Amino acid sequence: IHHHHHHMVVNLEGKISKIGQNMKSSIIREILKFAADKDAISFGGGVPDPETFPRKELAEIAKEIIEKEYHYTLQYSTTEGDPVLKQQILKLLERMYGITGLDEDNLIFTVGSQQALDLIGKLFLDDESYCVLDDPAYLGAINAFRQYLANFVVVPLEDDGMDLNVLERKLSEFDKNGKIKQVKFIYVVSNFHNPAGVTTSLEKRKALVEIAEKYDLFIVEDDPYGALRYEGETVDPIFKIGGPERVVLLNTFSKVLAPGLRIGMVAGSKEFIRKIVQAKQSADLCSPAITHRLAARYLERYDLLEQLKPTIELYRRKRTVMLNALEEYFSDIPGVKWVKSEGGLFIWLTLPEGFDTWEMFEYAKRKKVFYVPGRVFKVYDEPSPSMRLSFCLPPDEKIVEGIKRLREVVLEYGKEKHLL
Amino acid sequence: HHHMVVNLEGKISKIGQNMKSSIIREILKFAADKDAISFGGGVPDPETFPRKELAEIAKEIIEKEYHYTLQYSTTEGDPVLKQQILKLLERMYGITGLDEDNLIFTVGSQQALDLIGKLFLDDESYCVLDDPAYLGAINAFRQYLANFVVVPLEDDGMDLNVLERKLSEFDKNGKIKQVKFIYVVSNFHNPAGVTTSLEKRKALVEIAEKYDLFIVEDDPYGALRYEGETVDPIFKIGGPERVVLLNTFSKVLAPGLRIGMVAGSKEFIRKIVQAKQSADLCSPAITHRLAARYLERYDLLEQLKPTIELYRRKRTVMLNALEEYFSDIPGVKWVKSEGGLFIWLTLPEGFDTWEMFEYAKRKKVFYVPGRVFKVYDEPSPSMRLSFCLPPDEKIVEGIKRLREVVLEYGKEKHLL
Ligand SMILES: *Cc1c(COP(=O)(O)O)cnc(C)c1O
Ligand SMILES: *Cc1c(COP(=O)(O)O)cnc(C)c1O
Numbered sequence: 056i057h058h059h060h061h062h063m064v065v066n067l068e069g070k071i072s073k074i075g076q077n078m079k080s081s082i083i084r085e086i087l088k089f090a091a092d093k094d095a096i097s098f099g100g101g102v103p104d105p106e107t108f109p110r111k112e113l114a115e116i117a118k119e120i121i122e123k124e125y126h127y128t129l130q131y132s133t134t135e136g137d138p139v140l141k142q143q144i145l146k147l148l149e150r151m152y153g154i155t156g157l158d159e160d161n162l163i164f165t166v167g168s169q170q171a172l173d174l175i176g177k178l179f180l181d182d183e184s185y186c187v188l189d190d191p192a193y194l195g196a197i198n199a200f201r202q203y204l205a206n207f208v209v210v211p212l213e214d215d216g217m218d219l220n221v222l223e224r225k226l227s228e229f230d231k232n233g234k235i236k237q238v239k240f241i242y243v244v245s246n247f248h249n250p251a252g253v254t255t256s257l258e259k260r261k262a263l264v265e266i267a268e269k270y271d272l273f274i275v276e277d278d279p280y281g282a283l284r285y286e287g288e289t290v291d292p293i294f295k296i297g298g299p300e301r302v303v304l305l306n307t308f309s310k311v312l313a314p315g316l317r318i319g320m321v322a323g324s325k326e327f328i329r330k331i332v333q334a335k336q337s338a339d340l341c342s343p344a345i346t347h348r349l350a351a352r353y354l355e356r357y358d359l360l361e362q363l364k365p366t367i368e369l370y371r372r373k374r375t376v377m378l379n380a381l382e383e384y385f386s387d388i389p390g391v392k393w394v395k396s397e398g399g400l401f402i403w404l405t406l407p408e409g410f411d412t413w414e415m416f417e418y419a420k421r422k423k424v425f426y427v428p429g430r431v432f433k434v435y436d437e438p439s440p441s442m443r444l445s446f447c448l449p450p451d452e453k454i455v456e457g458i459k460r461l462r463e464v465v466l467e468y469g470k471e472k473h474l475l
Numbered sequence: 476h477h478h479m480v481v482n483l484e485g486k487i488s489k490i491g492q493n494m495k496s497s498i499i500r501e502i503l504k505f506a507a508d509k510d511a512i513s514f515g516g517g518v519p520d521p522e523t524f525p526r527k528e529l530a531e532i533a534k535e536i537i538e539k540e541y542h543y544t545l546q547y548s549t550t551e552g553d554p555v556l557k558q559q560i561l562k563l564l565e566r567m568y569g570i571t572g573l574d575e576d577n578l579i580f581t582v583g584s585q586q587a588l589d590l591i592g593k594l595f596l597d598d599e600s601y602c603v604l605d606d607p608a609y610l611g612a613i614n615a616f617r618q619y620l621a622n623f624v625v626v627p628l629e630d631d632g633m634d635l636n637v638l639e640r641k642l643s644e645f646d647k648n649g650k651i652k653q654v655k656f657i658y659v660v661s662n663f664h665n666p667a668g669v670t671t672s673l674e675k676r677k678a679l680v681e682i683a684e685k686y687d688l689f690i691v692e693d694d695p696y697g698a699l700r701y702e703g704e705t706v707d708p709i710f711k712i713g714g715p716e717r718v719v720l721l722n723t724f725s726k727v728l729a730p731g732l733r734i735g736m737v738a739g740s741k742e743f744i745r746k747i748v749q750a751k752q753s754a755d756l757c758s759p760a761i762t763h764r765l766a767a768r769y770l771e772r773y774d775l776l777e778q779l780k781p782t783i784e785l786y787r788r789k790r791t792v793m794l795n796a797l798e799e800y801f802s803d804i805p806g807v808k809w810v811k812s813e814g815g816l817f818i819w820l821t822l823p824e825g826f827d828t829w830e831m832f833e834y835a836k837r838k839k840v841f842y843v844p845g846r847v848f849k850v851y852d853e854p855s856p857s858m859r860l861s862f863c864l865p866p867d868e869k870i871v872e873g874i875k876r877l878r879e880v881v882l883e884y885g886k887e888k889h890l891l
Contacts, residue, residue: 060716063716064742066687067689067740067742067743069652070595070655070656070689071594071595071746072593072594072595072596072597072600072619073597074593074594074597075593075594075595075746075750078749078750078753079753080749080752081752084549102546102547105541105542105545105546108541108545110537110538110541110545111538113537113545114533114534114535114537114538115534117530117533117534117537117761118530118531118533118534119530121526121529121530121533122526122527122530125521125524125526126521127731128731129521129524129526129529129729129730129731129732130518130519130521130524130729130730130731131518131725131730131731132731165755166582166754166755166758166759167755167756169753169754169755169756170754170755173753173754173755177488177490177491178487178488178490178491179486179487179488179491180488181488181489181490184488195753195756198752198753199753199754202750202753203488236485239486240486271479271482273483273486300479309547313545313546314545314546314547315544315545315546315547315548315759315760315761316545316759316761317755317756317757317758317759324483326480326483327483330487330491330494333494333495333496334491334494334618336496336497336614337494337495337585337589337611337614337615337618338582338585338586338589338615338754339581339582339583339585339586339589339733340583340585340611340733341733342582342733343582343731343732343733343759343762344731345533345731345732345761345762346759346761346762
């Protein structure tokens with residue numbers, strides 16, 4: 056009534072920065088909205104099983120540290136992070152990976168490894184910069200980086216890691232056009248990739264360090280899942296191979312302790328870490344001291360690597376159930392393939408050419424079986440015949456039943472499209 | 476060679492280049508020494524925290540509510556907490572008419588400042604703030620290459636004559652679209668201690684409406700009032716279409732929870748959700764649910780009373796000591812704060828509280844030099860003092876130390 060206000064809205068939308076205009080929302084929650092319905096079976100999870108968390112122990116420690124250590128735990132803390140937790144982290148890295156030679160100034164804690172990704176983006180990426188990552192890649196990293204108007208150099212991922220031939224070709228092109236200064240870093244997930252379940256070979260790890268050196272790049276090694284190994288041996292981290300001069304290591308408590316703590320660990324050069332401290336201080340002053348000290352006391356009192364063993368046994372069992380069900384129900388469709396993940400939370404399944412797992416998702420919802428369509432993990436959002444599956448949450452019998460439902464989905468959709 | 480350090484510095488973005496570290500950590504490095512007395516703190520006294528109440532609740536929500544507290548949560552924040560905030564806003568300020576989609580929780584009010592800056596500021600944008608201003612806002616905004624319209628702060632708030640003159644100049648040069656918002660701290664200013672009068676609050680809303688700006692009202696301290704009556708928030712006057720309201724649990728419950736409350740229009744909040752999700756996915760559910768069950772179970776406004784008695788006592792001891800020990804020094808003034816954590820003191824013309832800091836360090840007495848709160852880093856005769864942490868006897872001893880410093884420096888400068 057000449058009061059079409061919304062105009063106030065267009066004025067606000069008018070005030071939004073370029074970063075603001077280039078922000079993306081994850082659609083995962085929307086599409087998994089009904090995934091917990093009674094007769095639904097969901098493989099769309101990206102999370103650990105909460106039934107595995109040491110809740111009684113964390114609860115007792117939480118009370119104790121608030122009551123007795125409140126001068127630390129309820130008060131503002133340093134941006135640099137809890138030095139008691141730092142001691143425990145330095146110990147874990149040495150016990151887990153044989154990483155040695157670091158001190159407290161090589162580390163900082165973030166609000167998840169997500170904040171680390173966001174702050175690395177903020178400090179290093181702009182509309183004139185490039186970052187190198189996989190196809191497929193972790194969604195959090197794509198969204199954290201793309202908001203800063205970054206350009207991407209996308210390299211296809213193979214069963215043993217990134218295709219280093221493609222990587223070298225692309226980098227060579229940048230060099231020949233005198234644009235290699237615009238390329239900043241390579242983002243990798245070296246153990247049990249999200250979404251691909253792939254583990255980067257030692258030889259490709261070493262080769263990545265060499266390529267980074269040649270083109271004066273650093274490497275951001277995101278490693279949420281390394282402790283969750285079901286077979287084989289732990290591979291040296293890229294961080295151990297290149298050192299903090301060349302590599303930033305991101306670990307998290309999300310997958311091995313509790314997402315709710317929101318604790319990411321960043322290890323790097325003292326110069327790099329000083330810059331993350333500056334960025335984090337303007338971003339949130341500090342992390343909640345409550346979370347840091349809780350984790351720190353837990354780790355002092357319980358050996359995480361030991362306490363993980365029954366959780367590893369459980370996830371291994373479930374991984375094997377899914378891989379067996381895949382072999383039983385997906386072995387007669389030519390062109391189907393999947394990564395036989397040796398750790399972590401995911402199996403990445405790829406259907407034959409022509410299959411579009413986004414288009415197919417309607418048939419899946421109709422059968423109440425859920426996965427993450429592969430397009431979600433593509434920087435440029437093109438159609439995908441792949442999907443991410445997680446075996447972590449459903450009970451064994453539902454893993455088998457869910458995989459049978461997916462077969463039915465594939466057959467229905469495949470036949471409607473004259474692919475089968 | 477070690478100068479791939481140079482390569483890394485070459486890789487850093489413009490935002491990364493325009494980033495200011497806080498100096499306060501550096502200047503207060505030795506302020507916890509044995510014989511030292513510090514007025515430099517900007518933090519509450521941990522001896523006032525409801526540590527027993529919070530500890531019990533923490534155990535309960537981790538053990539019994541773990542599906543919520545130990546798992547990822549929504550970026551939007553805990554709805555249980557949101558229902559308590561809606562109640563509190565009404566009981567504290569008489570604010571009504573909001574729902575959950577007008578709220579989000581951030582990792583302190585600091586993250587809210589950072590996300591507002593990210594979303595609204597860039598090298599072609601301006602925001603309006605006070606001289607002096609809160610350092611956390613200065614640093615959160617400057618990182619995004621923002622230009623500042625700085626307005627002198629008077630004892631009852633911003634000089635609005637200056638504000639309207641400067642915005643008029645923008646408007647006359649057709650640049651008013653580049654001005655995004657006005658940042659204010661309406662109760663018990665950090666660092667100034669001042670409270671904006673209701674008249675200036677209403678006028679601020681009019682100006683913002685006239686020039687199509689929004690107002691970011693940062694209010695950490697409103698509940699720590701030692702005398703007088705609570706004033707209507709700017710948010711209550713302009714509403715969510717015009718104003719974003721920032722509250723925090725830091726000064727009234729516990730800084731270590733890292734909980735800022737942001738209230739605004741549903742469109743604004745949705746953009747904040749989008750920005751937060753890429754920044755950190757979500758805040759720790761443990762912190763939110765802890766605060767929620769605390770507020771359900773204990774009346775914060777009642778639990779604050781002994782805290783207010785303590786702080787008010789210390790405040791008066793400091794003012795009384797300033798009276799005793801600065802009475803005979805012409806030109807010195809200070810804000811007789813009625814709330815919050817700070818007294819803002821100004822020395823005579825010619826005194827430079829940065830220069831003078833070396834004499835203070837020598838007497839082992841600490842303050843925050845006023846230049847820290849100045850966007851353009853020019854010399855200041857002022858300093859921020861806090862009365863929260865030192866025991867009463869050290870408040871007196873410390874103010875006497877400060878007198879001796881002012882006299883030592885002033886004599887050397889031939890100002891006294
Ligand atoms: C799960 C995951 C994360 C977890 O992020 P947090 O913020 O630490 O909880 C980070 N990176 C990758 C590759 C992941 O899969
Ligand atoms: C104390 C203070 C803050 C509180 O910061 P948090 O990040 O919520 O802990 C914010 N704004 C002002 C003006 C302050 O004085």
